[PDB]
Write an enzyme that holds these catalytic residues in place. Sequence first.
Site, PDB file in Angstrom:
ATOM      1  N   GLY A 112      -2.237  -2.152   4.089  1.00 34.76           N
ATOM      2  CA  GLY A 112      -1.482  -3.424   4.031  1.00 34.76           C
ATOM      3  C   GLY A 112      -1.069  -3.806   2.603  1.00 34.76           C
ATOM      4  N   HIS A 162       6.599   6.678   0.819  1.00 35.48           N
ATOM      5  CA  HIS A 162       5.995   6.819   2.179  1.00 35.48           C
ATOM      6  C   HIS A 162       6.470   5.722   3.157  1.00 35.48           C
ATOM      7  CE1 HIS A 162       2.398   4.444   0.526  1.00 35.48           C
ATOM      8  NE2 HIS A 162       2.710   3.778   1.653  1.00 35.48           N
ATOM      9  N   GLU A 189       6.656   8.927  -6.065  1.00 38.93           N
ATOM     10  CA  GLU A 189       6.238   8.029  -4.952  1.00 38.93           C
ATOM     11  C   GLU A 189       6.984   6.701  -5.059  1.00 38.93           C
ATOM     12  OE1 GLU A 189       4.868   9.139  -2.283  1.00 38.93           O
ATOM     13  OE2 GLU A 189       4.717   7.168  -1.300  1.00 38.93           O
ATOM     14  N   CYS A 219       0.099  -1.521   0.081  1.00 33.85           N
ATOM     15  CA  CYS A 219       1.108  -0.635  -0.540  1.00 33.85           C
ATOM     16  C   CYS A 219       2.392  -1.433  -0.793  1.00 33.85           C
ATOM     17  CB  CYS A 219       1.371   0.612   0.294  1.00 33.85           C
ATOM     18  SG  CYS A 219      -0.091   1.675   0.442  1.00 33.85           S
TER      19      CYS A 219
END
Length: 182
Positions: free
Chosen positions: A146, A41, A72, A148
Amino acid sequence: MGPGFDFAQAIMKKNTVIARTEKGEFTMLGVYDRVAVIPTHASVGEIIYINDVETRVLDACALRDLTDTNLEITIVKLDRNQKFRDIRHFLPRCEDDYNDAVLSVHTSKFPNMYIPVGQVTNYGFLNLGGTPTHRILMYNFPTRAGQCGGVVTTTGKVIGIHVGGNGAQGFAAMLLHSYFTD
């Protein structure tokens, strides 16, 4: 404060950089040579900022399992003039649960942050921001925006990177040895 945070601190001080994309600043774990990982992401492009240095991206690969499901994890290769300490020997070979874990973050906003998140479950399937995702680790901490890219470690193992949460729980994408074979 204890042996968990000691291991965590040893990884953060040598094997992380601050990654900035158009989607914001991320904790980025350097694994070996010029190869690093970041949540998919982050939307890595051709150019990335690494400790506020404009860096060409030589390659970027968004991992999926063989069922063709999102993991991911994006593996990035950086046009950087320095190699990372090789930490591939700290990576698990198999999916597993883990007892005592620490989540470590280093951004502008959250420097030198270490969270004792406790027991880590092999959750498996998660609908993550609407995307079916495999190989998810779950810990019972109210993780926030904040965090990730945050590195999830036990003493002696780097087991995952923080990719989301629901206000009660946090979720990490597993790191496995077989992702970084060369």
